[PDB]
Design an enzyme around this catalytic site. Structure first.
Site, short mmCIF file in Angstrom:
data_model
loop_
_atom_site.label_atom_id
_atom_site.label_comp_id
_atom_site.label_asym_id
_atom_site.label_seq_id
_atom_site.Cartn_x
_atom_site.Cartn_y
_atom_site.Cartn_z
N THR A 129 0.87 -1.16 0.00
CA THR A 129 0.00 0.00 0.00
C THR A 129 0.92 1.22 0.00
O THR A 129 1.63 1.47 0.98
CB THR A 129 -0.88 -0.01 1.26
N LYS A 155 4.58 -8.75 3.75
CA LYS A 155 3.25 -8.18 3.75
C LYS A 155 2.36 -9.12 2.92
O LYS A 155 1.86 -8.77 1.87
CB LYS A 155 3.29 -6.78 3.15
N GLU A 180 4.38 -4.69 16.79
CA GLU A 180 3.96 -3.58 15.95
C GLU A 180 2.59 -3.06 16.37
O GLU A 180 2.18 -3.19 17.51
CB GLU A 180 3.89 -4.02 14.49
C1 LIG Z 1 0.30 -5.26 10.17
C2 LIG Z 1 1.04 -4.14 9.49
N1 LIG Z 1 2.25 -3.69 10.01
C3 LIG Z 1 3.01 -2.68 9.46
C4 LIG Z 1 2.55 -2.06 8.32
C5 LIG Z 1 3.39 -0.94 7.68
O1 LIG Z 1 4.09 -1.07 6.45
P1 LIG Z 1 4.34 0.14 5.42
O2 LIG Z 1 5.24 1.08 6.08
O3 LIG Z 1 5.00 -0.55 4.22
O4 LIG Z 1 3.03 0.65 5.01
C6 LIG Z 1 1.30 -2.44 7.69
C7 LIG Z 1 0.86 -1.73 6.47
N2 LIG Z 1 -0.27 -1.07 6.37
C8 LIG Z 1 -0.68 -0.30 5.10
C9 LIG Z 1 -0.64 1.08 5.34
O5 LIG Z 1 -1.92 1.40 5.68
N3 LIG Z 1 -2.74 0.22 5.64
C10 LIG Z 1 -1.99 -0.79 5.30
O6 LIG Z 1 -2.62 -1.92 5.22
C11 LIG Z 1 0.55 -3.49 8.29
O7 LIG Z 1 -0.62 -3.94 7.82
#
Ligand SMILES: Cc1ncc(COP(=O)(O)O)c(CN[C@@H]2CONC2=O)c1O
Ligand SMILES: Cc1ncc(COP(=O)(O)O)c(CN[C@@H]2CONC2=O)c1O
Lengths: 269, 269
Positions: free
Chosen positions: B28, B140, B173
């Site tokens: 994303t 991801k 996280e």
């Molecule tokens: C569980 C989880 N952890 C960390 C991150 C962060 O990664 P990035 O820095 O690459 O975005 C995401 C991303 N989430 C995107 C950003 O907003 N919604 C999402 O699903 C996420 O779903």
């Protein structure tokens, strides 16, 4: 072809959460002589999965009817049902999502299963360990990447199924089946409150074993522990039960549990 | 609308493994002034995810082009890319599956993010703990039921994001963001080799912090440990960084790390 929300469809909206996050559950049932074997158990487990996933559905009666129709059409084979939260919600949020999607399909009964039955199962220990999460444990939800990874590693060996441990080292199940092992009169099966899938055949077998003269125990056991069993058996709705010739190079001599469950597992609901 | 395998489509084959097992990955990204922010990092992470998932794709150049086109069209907002193993394979098997599916879409930039920035983030500890699995950790991938469950619980509180621990108790996280906390000149972020998502913004921030006068450390820390920080910050590609007012009722006074990262996180690639 698939039956989605009441009609023939070969495609699904891309926005569906099953597609985006595997946000849903499913079941895979055996179709024999035009009947869904263990139908009520399959419905019941889909309901428990939707409940634990907070997916609210009021289509159970229609879903059952639909399952019986497809089953009558197919006559013999496999019937798969998928239920997802549907589309909607911002990000991972379930708020404003729905209504739930229901997807049904049937395929002919696999070929390899029969031969596997007339030759015995060989298990290989899996390097992929299941993460533990009581919030998802037991449910046949759509996040099966662990199973895809377990399967890929399994194909790198000569075994028919994998012996899967969880992140703490506890024997949990197989790639697509549950496991029981026997020591004399004691039959063991891993507790699935932390990982694994609480299968329809496992529940059926546990009901049989419970009422039988066999002492059934749900345990937290190490690999070494399980590997000192007289016999090992694996199960799923489609097998429905298979004798294990050996795990790794640890051979199993008996098949009495198997002989006891086999006949009883192909005559249920 | 979505761009699937090179063309406009609103639906996807039901047989696609993203739908059946969430067998795939995604990213994303932030779209600003018609440009995908941190484009090469997004491509690079999709490649690492496909690699770890054994999904072989030779469409990277076309995927990048496609991302830039959609981004130019959208101008400002969010660009989502999904890659799945596609259809095929018997059961969980990847054998005979493919070719991979690529799905692209863009939506306008969310509204709540801006207000969240001008009011501070409030974190609530999540009752849902991430299962640990080094085979899926960091990627991801599409199995985000844990995130859906974390999010549902989070909505039962007044917090904007969750503080997520893994099955061993280690702070990992947030629901949809990575976390950093500061103690004086030491900036901490959880190691993601066992769970969590190694985000694009986390990697960007780690590169900044590494080269900065701040001492960056990737740790395995307990909740109590993380909660004794002077400042807490969370990040994702879209925020891109947010200051945390407090976790539970443990307030954080400083925002210097935040003030240091904020400006630098909205001018990258
Ligand atoms: C569980 C989880 N952890 C960390 C991150 C962060 O990664 P990035 O820095 O690459 O975005 C995401 C991303 N989430 C995107 C950003 O907003 N919604 C999402 O699903 C996420 O779903
Ligand atoms: C990981 C896993 N464990 C156990 C089971 C067994 O549950 P049932 O007894 O309800 O089938 C399955 C189901 N596997 C079906 C059966 O065959 N293929 C499947 O995906 C499974 O995928």
């Amino acid at each position: 072809m698939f039956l989605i929300n009441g009609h023939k469809q070969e495609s699904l909206a891309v926005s569906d959460r099953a597609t985006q996050f595997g946000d849903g559950c499913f079941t895979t049932a055996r179709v024999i002589d035009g009947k869904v074997s263990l139908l009520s158990a399959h419905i019941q487990r889909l309901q428990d999965a939707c409940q634990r996933l907070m997916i609210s559905c009021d289509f159970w009666p229609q879903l059952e009817q639909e399952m019986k129709t497809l089953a009558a059409e197919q006559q013999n084979g496999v019937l798969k049902v998928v239920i997802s939260r549907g589309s909607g919600g911002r990000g991972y949020s379930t708020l404003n999502s729905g209504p739930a999607t229901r997807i049904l399909s049937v395929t002919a009964y696999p070929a390899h299963y029969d031969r596997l039955r007339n030759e015995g199962i060989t298990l290989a220990l899996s390097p992929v360990r299941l993460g533990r999460n009581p919030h998802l444990a037991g449910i046949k939800h759509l996040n099966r990447l662990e199973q895809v990874l377990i399967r890929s590693h399994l194909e790198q060996t000569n075994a028919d199924e994998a012996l899967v441990l969880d992140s703490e080292g506890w024997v949990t199940e197989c790639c697509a089946a549950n496991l029981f092992w026997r020591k004399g009169n004691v039959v063991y099966t891993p507790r699935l409150d932390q990982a694994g899938v609480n299968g329809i055949m496992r529940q059926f077998c546990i009901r049989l074993l419970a009422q039988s003269s066999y002492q059934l125990v749900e345990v937290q056991a190490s690999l070494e522990e399980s590997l000192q069993a007289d016999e090992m058996v694996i199960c799923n709705a489609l097998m429905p039960v298979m004798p294990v010739c050996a795990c790794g190079d640890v051979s199993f001599s008996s098949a009495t549990l198997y002989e006891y469950l086999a006949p009883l597992c192909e005559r249920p609901n």
